[PDB]
Amino acid sequence: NAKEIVVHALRLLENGDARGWSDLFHPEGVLEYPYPPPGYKTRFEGRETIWAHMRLFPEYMTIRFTDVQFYETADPDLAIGEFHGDGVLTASGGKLAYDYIAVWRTRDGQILLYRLFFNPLR
Ligand SMILES: C[C@]12CC[C@H](O)C[C@H]1CC[C@@H]1[C@@H]2C[C@@H](O)[C@]2(C)[C@@H](C3=CC(=O)OC3)CC[C@]12O
């Protein structure tokens, strides 16, 4: 189910496995930053592109997430949840913090939609 897939993914990212995380997306699957920070795209259509975006992730930062607080949905293939992320820039130093809310949509064990809200000012 979606909640299962989401936790899996977040774990993969915590482990720095960006290809894995990427791989969890349906080929024509989409990543979105509804409130994108400046200098970044806001939609990433297709696994290849999502991968291209996330490729560099582990090189600049390492993240650790709080446990997702999901809200109960009807559809088991839709998950809506809030969670926090703390990052440490490989620079290094740089502690970086995020408070998310996301709408995940899955099918046959793959991620179709990853809509990740966060504060672009912050
Ligand atoms: C917007 C962001 C800001 C920090 C850094 O400059 C990289 C950019 C692009 C990549 C972006 C970070 C913030 C982070 O919170 C992210 C949203 C983070 C993610 C968490 C998640 O569940 O999906 C992606 C990993 C990296 C991230 O995807």
Side-chain angles (χ1 to χ4, degrees), residues 1-2 5-6 8-10 12-18 20-22 25-27 29-40 42 44 46-47 49-54 56-62 65-68 70-71 73-87 90-91 93-94 97-100 102-104 106-109 112-120:
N1 88 335
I5 292 170
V6 172
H8 178 28
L10 291 178
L12 278 171
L13 258 201
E14 275 173 313
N15 272 348
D17 181 0
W21 185 87
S22 320
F25 272 87
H26 174 290
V30 179
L31 168 70
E32 336 193 284
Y33 301 150
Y35 310 157
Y40 292 80
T42 174
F44 301 73
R47 166 140 81 261
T49 319
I50 301 184
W51 161 237
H53 170 34
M54 275 287 159
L56 190 73
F57 167 62
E59 331 273 307
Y60 54 89
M61 144 192 277
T62 168
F65 299 114
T66 70
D67 286 49
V68 170
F70 293 102
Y71 303 85
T73 57
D75 189 314
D77 279 339
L78 170 56
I80 310 190
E82 297 196 46
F83 61 108
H84 175 106
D86 301 290
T90 64
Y98 304 109
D99 297 309
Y100 307 105
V103 176
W104 293 279
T106 67
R107 175 160 84 216
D108 331 322
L112 302 189
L113 177 73
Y114 203 122
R115 206 161 141 78
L116 193 68
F117 297 83
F118 45 83
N119 190 338

PDB file of all heavy atoms in Angstrom, residues 10 13 21 31 33 37 40 53-54 57 60-61 65 83 98 100 114 116 118, ligand 1:
ATOM      1  N   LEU A  10      11.257   7.010   2.026  1.00  0.00           N
ATOM      2  CA  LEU A  10      11.911   7.906   2.951  1.00  0.00           C
ATOM      3  C   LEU A  10      13.162   7.224   3.552  1.00  0.00           C
ATOM      4  O   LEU A  10      14.226   7.845   3.669  1.00  0.00           O
ATOM      5  CB  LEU A  10      10.909   8.356   4.018  1.00  0.00           C
ATOM      6  CG  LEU A  10       9.843   9.262   3.436  1.00  0.00           C
ATOM      7  CD1 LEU A  10       8.858   9.638   4.526  1.00  0.00           C
ATOM      8  CD2 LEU A  10      10.439  10.497   2.773  1.00  0.00           C
ATOM      9  N   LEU A  13      15.988   7.158   1.156  1.00  0.00           N
ATOM     10  CA  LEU A  13      16.591   8.477   1.090  1.00  0.00           C
ATOM     11  C   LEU A  13      17.463   8.692   2.309  1.00  0.00           C
ATOM     12  O   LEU A  13      18.512   9.323   2.200  1.00  0.00           O
ATOM     13  CB  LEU A  13      15.528   9.614   0.995  1.00  0.00           C
ATOM     14  CG  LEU A  13      15.118  10.377  -0.273  1.00  0.00           C
ATOM     15  CD1 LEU A  13      14.474  11.703   0.137  1.00  0.00           C
ATOM     16  CD2 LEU A  13      16.267  10.656  -1.215  1.00  0.00           C
ATOM     17  N   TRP A  21      15.404   5.208  -4.485  1.00  0.00           N
ATOM     18  CA  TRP A  21      14.251   6.098  -4.326  1.00  0.00           C
ATOM     19  C   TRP A  21      13.678   6.405  -5.689  1.00  0.00           C
ATOM     20  O   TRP A  21      12.490   6.215  -5.930  1.00  0.00           O
ATOM     21  CB  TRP A  21      14.734   7.379  -3.642  1.00  0.00           C
ATOM     22  CG  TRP A  21      13.697   8.369  -3.292  1.00  0.00           C
ATOM     23  CD1 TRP A  21      12.960   8.402  -2.156  1.00  0.00           C
ATOM     24  CD2 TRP A  21      13.325   9.520  -4.054  1.00  0.00           C
ATOM     25  NE1 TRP A  21      12.123   9.486  -2.171  1.00  0.00           N
ATOM     26  CE2 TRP A  21      12.330  10.191  -3.330  1.00  0.00           C
ATOM     27  CE3 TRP A  21      13.726  10.039  -5.290  1.00  0.00           C
ATOM     28  CZ2 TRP A  21      11.726  11.351  -3.802  1.00  0.00           C
ATOM     29  CZ3 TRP A  21      13.134  11.180  -5.747  1.00  0.00           C
ATOM     30  CH2 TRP A  21      12.151  11.834  -5.005  1.00  0.00           C
ATOM     31  N   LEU A  31       7.318  13.957  -9.702  1.00  0.00           N
ATOM     32  CA  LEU A  31       7.698  14.640  -8.473  1.00  0.00           C
ATOM     33  C   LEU A  31       7.363  16.110  -8.613  1.00  0.00           C
ATOM     34  O   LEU A  31       7.647  16.693  -9.648  1.00  0.00           O
ATOM     35  CB  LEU A  31       9.190  14.460  -8.231  1.00  0.00           C
ATOM     36  CG  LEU A  31       9.801  15.337  -7.149  1.00  0.00           C
ATOM     37  CD1 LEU A  31       9.307  14.897  -5.781  1.00  0.00           C
ATOM     38  CD2 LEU A  31      11.321  15.269  -7.229  1.00  0.00           C
ATOM     39  N   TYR A  33       7.268  20.078  -6.515  1.00  0.00           N
ATOM     40  CA  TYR A  33       7.419  21.023  -5.441  1.00  0.00           C
ATOM     41  C   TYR A  33       6.433  22.173  -5.631  1.00  0.00           C
ATOM     42  O   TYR A  33       6.768  23.200  -6.195  1.00  0.00           O
ATOM     43  CB  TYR A  33       8.836  21.580  -5.389  1.00  0.00           C
ATOM     44  CG  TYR A  33       9.950  20.587  -5.199  1.00  0.00           C
ATOM     45  CD1 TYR A  33      11.205  20.842  -5.730  1.00  0.00           C
ATOM     46  CD2 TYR A  33       9.780  19.413  -4.472  1.00  0.00           C
ATOM     47  CE1 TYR A  33      12.258  19.951  -5.576  1.00  0.00           C
ATOM     48  CE2 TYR A  33      10.829  18.499  -4.323  1.00  0.00           C
ATOM     49  CZ  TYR A  33      12.070  18.780  -4.874  1.00  0.00           C
ATOM     50  OH  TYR A  33      13.131  17.924  -4.736  1.00  0.00           O
ATOM     51  N   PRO A  37      11.425  26.381  -4.171  1.00  0.00           N
ATOM     52  CA  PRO A  37      12.323  27.467  -3.842  1.00  0.00           C
ATOM     53  C   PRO A  37      12.837  28.026  -5.135  1.00  0.00           C
ATOM     54  O   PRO A  37      12.787  27.336  -6.157  1.00  0.00           O
ATOM     55  CB  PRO A  37      13.441  26.787  -3.089  1.00  0.00           C
ATOM     56  CG  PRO A  37      13.469  25.415  -3.659  1.00  0.00           C
ATOM     57  CD  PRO A  37      12.062  25.065  -4.063  1.00  0.00           C
ATOM     58  N   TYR A  40      14.855  26.500  -8.724  1.00  0.00           N
ATOM     59  CA  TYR A  40      14.560  25.081  -8.916  1.00  0.00           C
ATOM     60  C   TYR A  40      13.279  24.896  -9.689  1.00  0.00           C
ATOM     61  O   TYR A  40      12.357  25.685  -9.554  1.00  0.00           O
ATOM     62  CB  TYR A  40      14.439  24.350  -7.571  1.00  0.00           C
ATOM     63  CG  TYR A  40      15.743  24.244  -6.788  1.00  0.00           C
ATOM     64  CD1 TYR A  40      16.204  25.328  -6.031  1.00  0.00           C
ATOM     65  CD2 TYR A  40      16.478  23.081  -6.764  1.00  0.00           C
ATOM     66  CE1 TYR A  40      17.360  25.251  -5.281  1.00  0.00           C
ATOM     67  CE2 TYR A  40      17.649  22.998  -6.030  1.00  0.00           C
ATOM     68  CZ  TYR A  40      18.090  24.086  -5.289  1.00  0.00           C
ATOM     69  OH  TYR A  40      19.265  24.000  -4.547  1.00  0.00           O
ATOM     70  N   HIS A  53      17.520  14.728 -11.254  1.00  0.00           N
ATOM     71  CA  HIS A  53      17.402  15.719 -10.196  1.00  0.00           C
ATOM     72  C   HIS A  53      18.013  15.209  -8.895  1.00  0.00           C
ATOM     73  O   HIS A  53      18.894  15.848  -8.322  1.00  0.00           O
ATOM     74  CB  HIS A  53      15.927  16.054 -10.006  1.00  0.00           C
ATOM     75  CG  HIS A  53      15.634  16.882  -8.797  1.00  0.00           C
ATOM     76  ND1 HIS A  53      16.490  17.847  -8.324  1.00  0.00           N
ATOM     77  CD2 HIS A  53      14.537  16.936  -8.010  1.00  0.00           C
ATOM     78  CE1 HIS A  53      15.940  18.448  -7.284  1.00  0.00           C
ATOM     79  NE2 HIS A  53      14.756  17.908  -7.069  1.00  0.00           N
ATOM     80  N   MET A  54      17.595  14.020  -8.473  1.00  0.00           N
ATOM     81  CA  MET A  54      18.057  13.451  -7.204  1.00  0.00           C
ATOM     82  C   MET A  54      19.463  12.858  -7.211  1.00  0.00           C
ATOM     83  O   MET A  54      20.071  12.712  -6.149  1.00  0.00           O
ATOM     84  CB  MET A  54      17.075  12.396  -6.722  1.00  0.00           C
ATOM     85  CG  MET A  54      15.946  13.014  -5.940  1.00  0.00           C
ATOM     86  SD  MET A  54      16.521  13.536  -4.323  1.00  0.00           S
ATOM     87  CE  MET A  54      15.228  14.719  -3.959  1.00  0.00           C
ATOM     88  N   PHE A  57      21.923  14.409  -4.907  1.00  0.00           N
ATOM     89  CA  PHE A  57      21.508  14.560  -3.496  1.00  0.00           C
ATOM     90  C   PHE A  57      22.578  14.170  -2.463  1.00  0.00           C
ATOM     91  O   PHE A  57      23.051  15.032  -1.713  1.00  0.00           O
ATOM     92  CB  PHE A  57      20.205  13.784  -3.253  1.00  0.00           C
ATOM     93  CG  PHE A  57      19.863  13.619  -1.819  1.00  0.00           C
ATOM     94  CD1 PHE A  57      19.628  14.728  -1.032  1.00  0.00           C
ATOM     95  CD2 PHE A  57      19.782  12.349  -1.250  1.00  0.00           C
ATOM     96  CE1 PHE A  57      19.308  14.584   0.305  1.00  0.00           C
ATOM     97  CE2 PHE A  57      19.452  12.197   0.080  1.00  0.00           C
ATOM     98  CZ  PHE A  57      19.221  13.315   0.859  1.00  0.00           C
ATOM     99  N   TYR A  60      25.746  16.420  -1.684  1.00  0.00           N
ATOM    100  CA  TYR A  60      25.733  17.701  -0.952  1.00  0.00           C
ATOM    101  C   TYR A  60      25.127  17.603   0.450  1.00  0.00           C
ATOM    102  O   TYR A  60      25.442  18.434   1.299  1.00  0.00           O
ATOM    103  CB  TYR A  60      25.079  18.833  -1.763  1.00  0.00           C
ATOM    104  CG  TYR A  60      23.683  18.548  -2.276  1.00  0.00           C
ATOM    105  CD1 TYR A  60      22.568  18.842  -1.509  1.00  0.00           C
ATOM    106  CD2 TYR A  60      23.487  17.990  -3.536  1.00  0.00           C
ATOM    107  CE1 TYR A  60      21.289  18.580  -1.968  1.00  0.00           C
ATOM    108  CE2 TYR A  60      22.227  17.730  -4.006  1.00  0.00           C
ATOM    109  CZ  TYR A  60      21.122  18.024  -3.222  1.00  0.00           C
ATOM    110  OH  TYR A  60      19.845  17.765  -3.710  1.00  0.00           O
ATOM    111  N   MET A  61      24.299  16.591   0.708  1.00  0.00           N
ATOM    112  CA  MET A  61      23.581  16.518   1.980  1.00  0.00           C
ATOM    113  C   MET A  61      23.233  15.107   2.413  1.00  0.00           C
ATOM    114  O   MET A  61      23.183  14.177   1.606  1.00  0.00           O
ATOM    115  CB  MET A  61      22.289  17.354   1.902  1.00  0.00           C
ATOM    116  CG  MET A  61      21.086  16.790   2.638  1.00  0.00           C
ATOM    117  SD  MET A  61      19.603  17.656   2.177  1.00  0.00           S
ATOM    118  CE  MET A  61      19.668  19.095   3.231  1.00  0.00           C
ATOM    119  N   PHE A  65      14.774  11.752   8.722  1.00  0.00           N
ATOM    120  CA  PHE A  65      13.348  12.117   8.868  1.00  0.00           C
ATOM    121  C   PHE A  65      12.691  11.622  10.131  1.00  0.00           C
ATOM    122  O   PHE A  65      12.956  10.520  10.604  1.00  0.00           O
ATOM    123  CB  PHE A  65      12.523  11.535   7.730  1.00  0.00           C
ATOM    124  CG  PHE A  65      12.931  12.020   6.390  1.00  0.00           C
ATOM    125  CD1 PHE A  65      13.475  11.142   5.471  1.00  0.00           C
ATOM    126  CD2 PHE A  65      12.754  13.350   6.040  1.00  0.00           C
ATOM    127  CE1 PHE A  65      13.846  11.576   4.227  1.00  0.00           C
ATOM    128  CE2 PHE A  65      13.122  13.798   4.794  1.00  0.00           C
ATOM    129  CZ  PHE A  65      13.668  12.905   3.886  1.00  0.00           C
ATOM    130  N   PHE A  83       5.463  15.298   7.855  1.00  0.00           N
ATOM    131  CA  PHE A  83       6.670  14.878   8.554  1.00  0.00           C
ATOM    132  C   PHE A  83       7.748  15.943   8.492  1.00  0.00           C
ATOM    133  O   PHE A  83       7.664  16.875   7.685  1.00  0.00           O
ATOM    134  CB  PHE A  83       7.214  13.575   7.969  1.00  0.00           C
ATOM    135  CG  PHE A  83       7.602  13.671   6.515  1.00  0.00           C
ATOM    136  CD1 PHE A  83       8.938  13.666   6.135  1.00  0.00           C
ATOM    137  CD2 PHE A  83       6.641  13.734   5.537  1.00  0.00           C
ATOM    138  CE1 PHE A  83       9.299  13.723   4.808  1.00  0.00           C
ATOM    139  CE2 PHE A  83       6.997  13.780   4.215  1.00  0.00           C
ATOM    140  CZ  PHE A  83       8.322  13.777   3.845  1.00  0.00           C
ATOM    141  N   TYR A  98      13.337  21.011   7.592  1.00  0.00           N
ATOM    142  CA  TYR A  98      12.149  21.029   6.740  1.00  0.00           C
ATOM    143  C   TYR A  98      10.949  20.469   7.477  1.00  0.00           C
ATOM    144  O   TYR A  98      11.058  19.487   8.239  1.00  0.00           O
ATOM    145  CB  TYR A  98      12.391  20.194   5.465  1.00  0.00           C
ATOM    146  CG  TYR A  98      13.596  20.660   4.700  1.00  0.00           C
ATOM    147  CD1 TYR A  98      14.754  19.910   4.657  1.00  0.00           C
ATOM    148  CD2 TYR A  98      13.590  21.888   4.082  1.00  0.00           C
ATOM    149  CE1 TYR A  98      15.882  20.368   3.992  1.00  0.00           C
ATOM    150  CE2 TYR A  98      14.704  22.351   3.422  1.00  0.00           C
ATOM    151  CZ  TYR A  98      15.845  21.597   3.372  1.00  0.00           C
ATOM    152  OH  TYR A  98      16.941  22.080   2.681  1.00  0.00           O
ATOM    153  N   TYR A 100       7.395  19.115   6.227  1.00  0.00           N
ATOM    154  CA  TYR A 100       6.685  18.729   5.023  1.00  0.00           C
ATOM    155  C   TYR A 100       5.196  18.427   5.239  1.00  0.00           C
ATOM    156  O   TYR A 100       4.726  18.244   6.376  1.00  0.00           O
ATOM    157  CB  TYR A 100       7.281  17.464   4.454  1.00  0.00           C
ATOM    158  CG  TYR A 100       8.757  17.478   4.223  1.00  0.00           C
ATOM    159  CD1 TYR A 100       9.634  16.791   5.079  1.00  0.00           C
ATOM    160  CD2 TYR A 100       9.281  18.111   3.129  1.00  0.00           C
ATOM    161  CE1 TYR A 100      11.003  16.784   4.857  1.00  0.00           C
ATOM    162  CE2 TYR A 100      10.640  18.111   2.895  1.00  0.00           C
ATOM    163  CZ  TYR A 100      11.501  17.447   3.764  1.00  0.00           C
ATOM    164  OH  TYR A 100      12.847  17.436   3.522  1.00  0.00           O
ATOM    165  N   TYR A 114       4.402  12.284  -6.278  1.00  0.00           N
ATOM    166  CA  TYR A 114       5.101  12.655  -5.078  1.00  0.00           C
ATOM    167  C   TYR A 114       5.033  14.184  -4.973  1.00  0.00           C
ATOM    168  O   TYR A 114       5.878  14.902  -5.503  1.00  0.00           O
ATOM    169  CB  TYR A 114       6.538  12.171  -5.200  1.00  0.00           C
ATOM    170  CG  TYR A 114       7.323  11.952  -3.940  1.00  0.00           C
ATOM    171  CD1 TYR A 114       7.873  10.712  -3.668  1.00  0.00           C
ATOM    172  CD2 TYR A 114       7.590  12.972  -3.082  1.00  0.00           C
ATOM    173  CE1 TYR A 114       8.632  10.479  -2.536  1.00  0.00           C
ATOM    174  CE2 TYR A 114       8.346  12.750  -1.942  1.00  0.00           C
ATOM    175  CZ  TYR A 114       8.866  11.507  -1.679  1.00  0.00           C
ATOM    176  OH  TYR A 114       9.642  11.310  -0.563  1.00  0.00           O
ATOM    177  N   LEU A 116       5.366  17.237  -2.781  1.00  0.00           N
ATOM    178  CA  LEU A 116       6.034  17.546  -1.521  1.00  0.00           C
ATOM    179  C   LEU A 116       6.001  19.028  -1.200  1.00  0.00           C
ATOM    180  O   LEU A 116       6.715  19.819  -1.833  1.00  0.00           O
ATOM    181  CB  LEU A 116       7.471  17.105  -1.615  1.00  0.00           C
ATOM    182  CG  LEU A 116       8.239  17.056  -0.311  1.00  0.00           C
ATOM    183  CD1 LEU A 116       7.718  15.958   0.608  1.00  0.00           C
ATOM    184  CD2 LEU A 116       9.697  16.795  -0.643  1.00  0.00           C
ATOM    185  N   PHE A 118       6.804  22.266   1.090  1.00  0.00           N
ATOM    186  CA  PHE A 118       7.661  22.763   2.125  1.00  0.00           C
ATOM    187  C   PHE A 118       7.789  24.266   1.985  1.00  0.00           C
ATOM    188  O   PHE A 118       7.314  24.854   1.022  1.00  0.00           O
ATOM    189  CB  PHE A 118       9.009  22.075   2.118  1.00  0.00           C
ATOM    190  CG  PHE A 118       9.610  21.934   0.772  1.00  0.00           C
ATOM    191  CD1 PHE A 118      10.314  22.972   0.211  1.00  0.00           C
ATOM    192  CD2 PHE A 118       9.528  20.730   0.094  1.00  0.00           C
ATOM    193  CE1 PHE A 118      10.918  22.826  -1.022  1.00  0.00           C
ATOM    194  CE2 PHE A 118      10.117  20.576  -1.145  1.00  0.00           C
ATOM    195  CZ  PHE A 118      10.810  21.627  -1.707  1.00  0.00           C
TER     196      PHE A 118
HETATM  197  C1  LIG B   1      14.944  22.195  -2.274  1.00  0.00           C
HETATM  198  C2  LIG B   1      16.199  21.522  -1.769  1.00  0.00           C
HETATM  199  C3  LIG B   1      16.748  22.514  -0.775  1.00  0.00           C
HETATM  200  C4  LIG B   1      18.085  22.041  -0.216  1.00  0.00           C
HETATM  201  C5  LIG B   1      19.129  21.813  -1.325  1.00  0.00           C
HETATM  202  O1  LIG B   1      19.614  23.075  -1.856  1.00  0.00           O
HETATM  203  C6  LIG B   1      18.576  20.972  -2.480  1.00  0.00           C
HETATM  204  C7  LIG B   1      17.190  21.422  -2.914  1.00  0.00           C
HETATM  205  C8  LIG B   1      16.726  20.449  -3.972  1.00  0.00           C
HETATM  206  C9  LIG B   1      16.367  19.085  -3.382  1.00  0.00           C
HETATM  207  C10 LIG B   1      15.433  19.152  -2.177  1.00  0.00           C
HETATM  208  C11 LIG B   1      16.000  20.124  -1.165  1.00  0.00           C
HETATM  209  C12 LIG B   1      15.144  20.124   0.094  1.00  0.00           C
HETATM  210  C13 LIG B   1      14.837  18.718   0.638  1.00  0.00           C
HETATM  211  O2  LIG B   1      13.896  18.849   1.715  1.00  0.00           O
HETATM  212  C14 LIG B   1      14.256  17.753  -0.387  1.00  0.00           C
HETATM  213  C15 LIG B   1      12.845  18.190  -0.736  1.00  0.00           C
HETATM  214  C16 LIG B   1      14.400  16.333   0.152  1.00  0.00           C
HETATM  215  C17 LIG B   1      13.285  15.343  -0.065  1.00  0.00           C
HETATM  216  C18 LIG B   1      12.608  14.756   0.933  1.00  0.00           C
HETATM  217  C19 LIG B   1      11.605  13.854   0.348  1.00  0.00           C
HETATM  218  O3  LIG B   1      10.871  13.064   0.900  1.00  0.00           O
HETATM  219  O4  LIG B   1      11.644  14.002  -1.079  1.00  0.00           O
HETATM  220  C20 LIG B   1      12.767  14.843  -1.402  1.00  0.00           C
HETATM  221  C21 LIG B   1      15.685  15.792  -0.458  1.00  0.00           C
HETATM  222  C22 LIG B   1      16.321  16.923  -1.236  1.00  0.00           C
HETATM  223  C23 LIG B   1      15.140  17.757  -1.592  1.00  0.00           C
HETATM  224  O5  LIG B   1      14.483  16.939  -2.523  1.00  0.00           O
END
